[PDB]
Amino acid sequence: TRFHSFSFYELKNVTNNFDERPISVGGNKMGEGGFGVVYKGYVNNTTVAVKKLAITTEELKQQFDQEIKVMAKCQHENLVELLGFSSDGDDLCLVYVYMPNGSLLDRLSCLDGTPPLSWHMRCKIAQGAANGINFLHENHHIHRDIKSANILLDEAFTAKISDFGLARASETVMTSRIVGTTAYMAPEALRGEITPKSDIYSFGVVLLEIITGLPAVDEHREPQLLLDIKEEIEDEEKTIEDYIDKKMNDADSTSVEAMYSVASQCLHEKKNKRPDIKKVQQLLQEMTA
Template identity: 60%
Template sequence: MNNSVTSATYIRNLSYTLRRRLSDFLDPQDRWKDVVVSIRKPGGELRYSQHHMRRFEGLVAQGRSPTEELLNDWGTTNSTVGELVDILRSHKLLAAASVLLPVQEASLAERQPACPVVAIESALPTRPLQERETQLPPVSPTLQPLILQESSEPGFSSFLYNELMEITGNFDNRPMSDGGSRLGEGGFGTVYKGVLNDKPVAVKKLNPMDDISSDELQVQFHQEIQTLKVLKHENLVDMVGFSCDGQHPCLVYAFMANGSLLDRLACLDDSPPLSWQRRCLIAEGTARGLEYLHCNHHVHRDVKSANILLDENLVAKISDFGLTRASARRTSTTMMTERIVGTRAYMAPEALRGEITPKSDVFSFGVVLLEILSGLPPASENQEPQFLMEFVYDIDDEDEDLTLEEFLDKKMTDWELSQVETVYSLASNCLHDRKNRRPVIKEVASELKGVVKSLSLA
């Protein structure tokens, strides 16, 4: 919900962030269609025809958001947030409505019983595509005991919540630059720096959010522990331990001195620009980490530059495994989920339909490669097109003025054209709308290894 938005606010004046949040609710399962068929002209007739509907549907195949296009089009009239919210509530799309305006108490009463159900379903093994019609396995009653038993696992420590409060200055929310402990926002929580046995650590305090229940937060907490317990690789972040006895569940990781790839590409805090050689090494390391995940039948589901952390030697470490899913049959087949998760600017078309497949991680990594090449953010209201993945259309279109050389990060001076062309071609292949036309991550890692090898020979 945004406090600056009222029922009288024109839809055309909604911020980019709010439009994106709405699309995250309405794009999956084509819920935007419920809105389209409810929009009327002043005379009472339908505003949108079947022709319009097909045009909106065509955007999905391009990896674009039909909800955003609908809001852009409908916003050319004097339509208001109040009208949109009324439509959303009439179709029981209460979570989407609450993005814009407070949900009435009656609506809240209808919504609340669903929260535990969502959390329970997301804790179950995700079903392979061919098993969509089979009965769900019984819910395990042992979620909380499983979490508590983690202290007996080798390599993990169980901390008291009060201990983590002490080493983070009572979770001092001031940024590090202002003398506080906050490093930034991580998946489902805030990350703080602490010192444990004379070694720096990062403590992620998980916080309930508007669209995430406390039960579901426990599921993400449990999922991250389970994933990092069984998966160990030099390009995956190291977990030190956890705490589950206090007000908030907490995860403790090895401290990453150079923060996230997203921040380093943006030269946040006046950090120096990453060289072309270093960017290639980071790309290769990330690909090897993903290859390890996929070889072990795990799909990350939220690959992005903010989740690629860099240690003191700028070695890439993939982080945030709360959304990671393992195949129920330990295979890499496509699976289905009823909850669409991830970050829209990185999501493959099939991910928006609820499919979970390793090829979706490959698509997201294609966006990361574009970030590495350009230094641009994955999405921005201040760039055209707003989504970085759409720059590929302009670069590849001979009628457009944008060239690959112009697309490159101007802060990077040591690049070599043939290497840049190889990485760009790889990114384009990763971003193919049809998942079967994308390379597998092993091929991506091999290609990047060749680029890194050519760097050492230059």
């Protein structure tokens, strides 16, 4: 697949000179992303998302081409679509289809006054995110930064996996540059292994965010790491019922426990005992049914 080539000055124009104030107070910045800031833009009659990158100039320019290459290969309804890029100006820009409901993280926390996601939407988002990861793994790609901040939500709350700057081919390797987000990372990934099984672990953490509405890490909390509640639940002090996000009216026990069962399996500490993504899809399908 080949993409539209934009000039920097069109993107500068349509993002109001890359206005770094939030959209809520009249600016253009929607979020800070993987190695770059994400601005809102209007090209033609289309709202778009423009990522301006901002490790070193060698590495950033390398994760520019990686992203384009992976997005050229990987097109699926549960992955964010790349519209284009810009190499010519000062900074390197990537241009995406606009996701009007932002990230799952932000909707889980009801940021900027948005209403809480129903259990029904949450189930759809979980199934969708898993279809996206399944497509990546079937096509021998490892994401390496699965987390709620990288699951975007469109006009219909369809889940879209985003940020393939870190992504790799399959077609277990090791690396010196350990990258990702600590609170979502599998033990092996924290030690430099690169395997699709790390993606499964991180998805398990996402499923706990979906059930509880709690962020993966909160410095002002006990436990500070959301994965730890798996331990608290297995040692029967608490139950999953006790952690269910209280900002839902429509969550039945049976379906929540079924999603938890999937998350628990995804969070197995031995990489080899985790289910593969296909098993995760199937289990998430059976949950609805």
